[PDB]
Subunit: 456 residues, 4 copies
């Protein structure tokens, strides 16, 4: 059904881009029932066919790279340079799934009178729910491994930037036609998250939820999901630590990127910077000065470093948080300033009890805490989250100690928390999530082991 | 605690053996708080120390081998020969965790100008909840891997057979003291499961739930657990299939064991036998005849093949399921007899619709269905469960088709469903559970991955 | 160089296609010296660059697929349809090496106070020596993983079919130029194998020999290589076994392929067929009838099933072996006819004492033995070689017994010895070789482990 | 036999301890011939029996712990405390092999129409050749995995310290008797290395040579082994690098151990120390001072740090090596003296051209070169060997640069080259050897892969 129910916004011009369908809970149910009927076909789809489909998707994404990046610029406000990077990553993500279909290993276990070996089989229907920020690559990170493991897919992309997922869905439709697979094996269900996304969570016919998005929606999902496999990638306030012996020049450059890439709207964005008291002044000055020269505006402009936040309503919320932060004694050093949703790089020096140390802002808003080395781990671990952390030092013993004691799914050394190599296992501890993504790792999540025992 | 609150019953004689402590919900909360204070100590315990603790536990179990078996016989009603086997496997389980502490591999991922490697760290507190039927070995399968991965443990054992677990708790305590580790890293919480175990399920301080028991409680745990890792080993109505080309004597011997070991009170016991039409009379004759001459009586007697069911309550209820199955057209071929808790081997021929095809009796009750080959997979797959299945044939092509199409965590070829090699990955699909046990596989559930990235 | 020293022959027409350089021992020494200068550049070449180079080779091969297949037909005498298949396989090989550059995993070993991890580094100079029969894909199986593991290469191709390798060298040259890697990291050295190949084997600057070819030369290499890692893939008389219970139609069809693909000039070609006495007459009848209607002639012709042998001199030798087999009591069932190098499908019935049971002819000559089952393994195991074996049966227990007892690098059930899946470990035991190929496995051979120990 | 052919010497007192058999070439031939008769038996020994044999060996070694240690002191000259540590490691080695017989995994490879899996099978007869320095643990590292993988063993132990290998052979014979395995599966062959060892190398019935000893004999083997798998663990001159930012106290302590443990007679003993010139005098002073107070004397005395070298003849050669090093301009800082075979801790300051930089002395003789950081990698890499290297620094980037660029099988950071954890892959590159040991790795060398393909 192609109706026109819901407004899609250009976050920069605030103009309506187009209208798209918004499914009702009842239509979401129907879509799931239909998807269930195709389980047997996906389960039995030969390896070669899975490989071919995945390769073809990567091929289409490549051929439409520039179109897709423009779409990311317009719909998600993603600076075109960063947008081309997201697209190239989606290419690699589908490509890597194709090869894991061919290369995935099972095991044989020794036995005196038995041949015991394992087999991986699909969990069945994979319910994928993706966010606005990297909607192409994050969708690739769910779709590619779901297809690689013989799963049927119902997918709800973020209403905040659904257009690239719509183009990917058509790309997927295209590859399925090419290799004679009914189109019902993948299903893009657009609409209101608390309706269409929620139906996916609750519906007893979905076998696994793979969710990337807000902490609050994540935590709800654990309570509503029921008897399903659950994978969650939520946010964090990602602490990046700069010890006195850090290469300051490189630490600043790395932290400018980790702070302000996609206007700080990344689950692994710099959330707080903890800097040794003895170098704090020199760091703050260099950091502030490099952030001063960032070009802030139209994501379609090649020269643009930082574009708008996803909506006016979030920008307005961030403005409040920044106000609350100054009230608690935060010292504003840059920005704290917005035109509509275009939020300027904002830097504050705060203490450890600040609101910004407990709040993921999804914004180019960076709190710097000057501290002694002995307090750093305490402060770093003091949140409810545990996604990514980073440390800048040249000291072996200190780096080993911090790396072991930081309670996070990822610890980055001499680069910001923002780092993610796509083929690495990735995810959080504590309230930051459940399970690991990265194609090989997601494949293991999106399948069940069958143990086969042959008695001799 | 010195309290003597809750009767423990000998299922054969129905006598009280003694009274153990029954903790309140408050006492469970308080015990969980205590365990939290030792998280850092368990987390930082060196490999050599976890190895030593684990090996010393195995050593103490070996020394007390015969006593512990007697306790299984008296408390769980397990025939003494079968109890000795359970004890032996629990020894193997603790020694195997000890070796995996030292051998468990992490990985390095290639990268230009980055060193990327993984590290497993404990989930924190592991709440372990275990059943009555294999309380020593099933405890071992949660405790041993939890210790190997540096977790603190709160453990609730089944009230129906707790005494062996209390002896294991004393063994663990000795081990901990011997190697100067505080005793609060391991906690045994006895009392009512729906209070004490429920608190373990529900407490926000528990990081992971590992549950083995009933499906009713399993499903309820998925809704109550919330933000924790969840591993479930629930039951099943395990289908055992005998094709026309099977070795009959060997199939009968295998299925006798699968049906009657521990009086059918095993999550992987034979739930139904499906036998080809052309060999059905020969099979049923031979099968019934072997069942006849099994010694029913005192678990303490070396001669006993079948002992009592775990409670009178459950046995009376079993007798009701039999009468109902006869009333649906079930043909009784053996037994149906019962003295108090002691339930005699009972075999019936039924159709695919009989209540027994959909009920996990946990009793020595075996429904046998004759049918064509083309209908076997449908019947086997027709349930809500997916723990273990078994197929008896010499046909390569048929064995492969069945192994691929049987919707189960385990498929056994030319032995019954009741097979489990301890070092194999083990668990169910559908309503039969989540995640896999076996020390190596449980260790990966009971730890979280940390990805460490060094920028070169 | 640009010299025209050595005839290259069309095996079908016996005409000189062209003349290629024949390097002296001094010239091969020089190329090896030059290759040595580039070890550090290859050793330090980034993952990204190696992946690009490997993918670019695959891409150029794909674009010249037909030209390359035609060279194989004209030069190696390979039927055009089979030549297309080799080309296609060679593409997959380079592609899979590219992925393994990005994905190959190292390990971390637990230690009390140390970080212990591994790192793979090139052996240095890989000396690759390849055969006439699959010169493109077998070269790929040496070059692709050599490049993936940061080795410099010296490669001697067979003088019997060098042209496609000279085309592959130009392809490699193009990929190197495109990514700014010096040309001397790969060196094709043509000429007399006993001069040039021998120099690769003998020269102390070569770190590793990877040889595929004849037993006589392989065995010599083990005595002449000295201090280098050695990998050998020699031939064998590959026994294929047909039990009484086999699907005869599938067996015949499979065996026709394994017998007559590339006129039996493959290392894993069918060497003998052992057939149960009870089904022998029917198997022989069928096999002979299918082999009659094979189209024998010009490999450039789409119609041709079987083309000529690699040289007259070899065809002449086979004829004598066949005449010797007939003198020993062999019964001619088909063929035995020769036209220059074009040898016709030849089938004989023999006993185990017949010379053909002990001789790898590299020819479409198939000896059949009728025997009883319990003699089959003994006959199969009776040679000095042990590359591949096959067994056709629908019996689980027999297939398991035969799989375990066959002293072979590979055991194929229900297809002929000729099966090789490129991504599988491949190689032989006894005099059939040392080490395994298939890209992942070859990478392990062409690198050395470095264990790195960081004391905390 | 009961023959008394060969004097066994106590290297401290120079007394004959006893005479033992010296086999002739002919008797070595017969022992290999008998060994061959047992290939099938070993190859078919079930997992459980291999496990039981291995653990029973470990157990006997533990019960005879102190005895074996005194033997090591009396026969090998090994100080008693270091002898205990060698015994304790050998125990672990046999235990770990037992673990791996049960736990070693094979793989399954995906395929559209095939089930493809691997199986390891014994190489056949393993020829083990061991040295004098760790005759018990190094034997364990060859025998334990050889039993694990189903091989027959013929084993020549060093004539310089055979007594403990004789005791181990009896322990093995005991283990074999207990579980009804013929004694012929393991054969200890004493006598001249150039006769008995050589026949093991040359004999065509031996399938694999695992050799640990001198580079000169190792090099020989590579020319004489013929068509067998070859694994060599030779020595080297192991460079240990001390950077200006190193913890000097820790470096000194680590380097005293690495230099003087077992009087420098370990294949991974410190062969040279490279120290930054800005810290040379401080390091040299502290190092010489610590070396001064070591107790040199009788290995049986508990106080003894350094016992004698293995023979007067070797001690006399070392004396001449030291004089040559002084003649070339080396500055003697300590020692350079001997009392028969007792050689005192000897330390010299030399330049990079000194004979000590190129010679493995197997003696407590330590050359120190003061240099600049940027020449250190060149000097470390400038020998023909490549076993172990070490670097002392607290600088992350430098440790990584050195770790990557040091051409060695092992790199130790912040401990000396002597470090070996028994469960880590261990071995050298360049002339330091081939293949890796550590039980799990040795198992892979001492077995062949078999690929089994089932067509569906
Ligand atoms: O926005 P954001 O990225 O900051 O984070 P978010 O609100 O948590 O959204 C992440 C994803 O989850 C969906 N979602 C929102 N509420 C949901 C619910 N109650 N149940 C299931 N799915 C839900 C969203 O759909 P929508 O964007 O369509 O709400 C989006 O696709
Ligand atoms: O007996 P069975 O094996 O047939 O099945 P079961 O009742 O599910 O018992 C399995 C285990 O779960 C416990 N349990 C029972 N109800 C629970 C609940 N609501 N929440 C958490 N744990 C609970 C039991 O403790 P109890 O045996 O003490 O009830 C026992 O340790
Ligand atoms: O003929 P074929 O295919 O049956 O098998 P083959 O002669 O063993 O040929 C296999 C490969 O080995 C080379 N070769 C031949 N003799 C050699 C030697 N003595 N040392 C090193 N390499 C040698 C061959 O080069 P050539 O084809 O140039 O002899 C060919 O490239
Ligand atoms: O003295 P070391 O420990 O410094 O090192 P080594 O001489 O290389 O001796 C190591 C081992 O190799 C044996 N061996 C010596 N010459 C041999 C040969 N030509 N062929 C095969 N094995 C040989 C030795 O036996 P022997 O000790 O009996 O010579 C010893 O068991």
């Amino acid at each position: 059904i192609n109706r026109e129910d819901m407004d899609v916004i250009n976050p920069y011009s605030l103009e309506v881009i187009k209208k798209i369908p918004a499914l009702s809970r009842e239509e979401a149910k129907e879509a799931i029932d239909t998807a269930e009927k195709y389980k047997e076909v996906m389960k039995n789809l030969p390896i070669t066919k899975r490989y071919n489909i995945l390769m073809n998707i990567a091929k289409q994404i490549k051929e439409k790279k520039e179109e897709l990046a423009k779409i990311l610029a317009i719909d998600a406000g993603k600076p075109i340079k960063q947008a081309r990077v997201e697209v190239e990553r989606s290419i690699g993500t589908f490509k890597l799934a194709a090869f894991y279909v061919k290369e995935h290993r099972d095991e044989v276990i020794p036995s005196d009178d038995r041949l015991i070996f394992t087999r991986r089989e699909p969990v069945g229907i994979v319910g994928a729910i993706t966010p606005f920020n990297f909607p192409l690559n994050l969708s690739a990170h769910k779709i590619a491994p779901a297809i690689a493991t013989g799963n049927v897919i119902v997918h709800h992309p973020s209403s905040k930037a659904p257009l690239v997922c719509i183009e990917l869905a058509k790309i997927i439709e295209n590859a399925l036609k090419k290799y004679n697979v009914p189109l019902g094996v993948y299903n893009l269900l657009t609409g209101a998250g608390e309706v269409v996304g929620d139906e996916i969570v609750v519906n007893e016919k979905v076998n696994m939820i793979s969710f990337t998005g807000s902490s609050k929606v994540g935590e709800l999902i654990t309570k509503k999901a029921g008897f399903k496999k659950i994978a969650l990638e939520l946010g964090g306030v990602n602490p990046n630590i700069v010890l006195k012996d850090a290469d300051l020049n490189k630490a600043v450059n790395a932290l400018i990127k980790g702070s302000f890439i996609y206007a700080g709207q990344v689950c692994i964005s710099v959330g707080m910077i903890l800097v040794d008291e003895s170098i704090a002044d020199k760091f703050i000055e260099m950091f502030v000065n490099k952030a001063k020269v960032l070009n802030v505006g139209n994501p379609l402009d090649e020269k643009t470093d930082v574009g708008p936040l996803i909506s006016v309503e979030h920008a307005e919320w961030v403005e409040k948080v920044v106000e609350k932060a100054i009230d608690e004694g935060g010292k504003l050093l840059l920005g704290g300033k917005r035109d509509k949703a275009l939020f300027y790089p904002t830097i504050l020096e705060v203490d450890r009890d600040n609101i910004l140390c407990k709040t993921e802002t999804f914004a180019p808003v960076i709190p710097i805490i000057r501290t002694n080395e002995e307090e750093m781990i305490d402060i770093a671990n003091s949140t409810e989250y545990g996604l990514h952390s980073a440390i800048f030092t040249n000291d072996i013993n200190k780096s080993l100690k911090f790396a072991e004691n930081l309670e996070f799914g990822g610890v980055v050394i001499n680069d910001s928390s923002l780092f993610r190599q796509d083929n690495m296992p990735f995810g959080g501890v504590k309230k930051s999530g459940l399970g690991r993504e990265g194609v090989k790792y997601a494949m293991e999540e999106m399948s069940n082991i069958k143990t086969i025992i042959i008695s001799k």
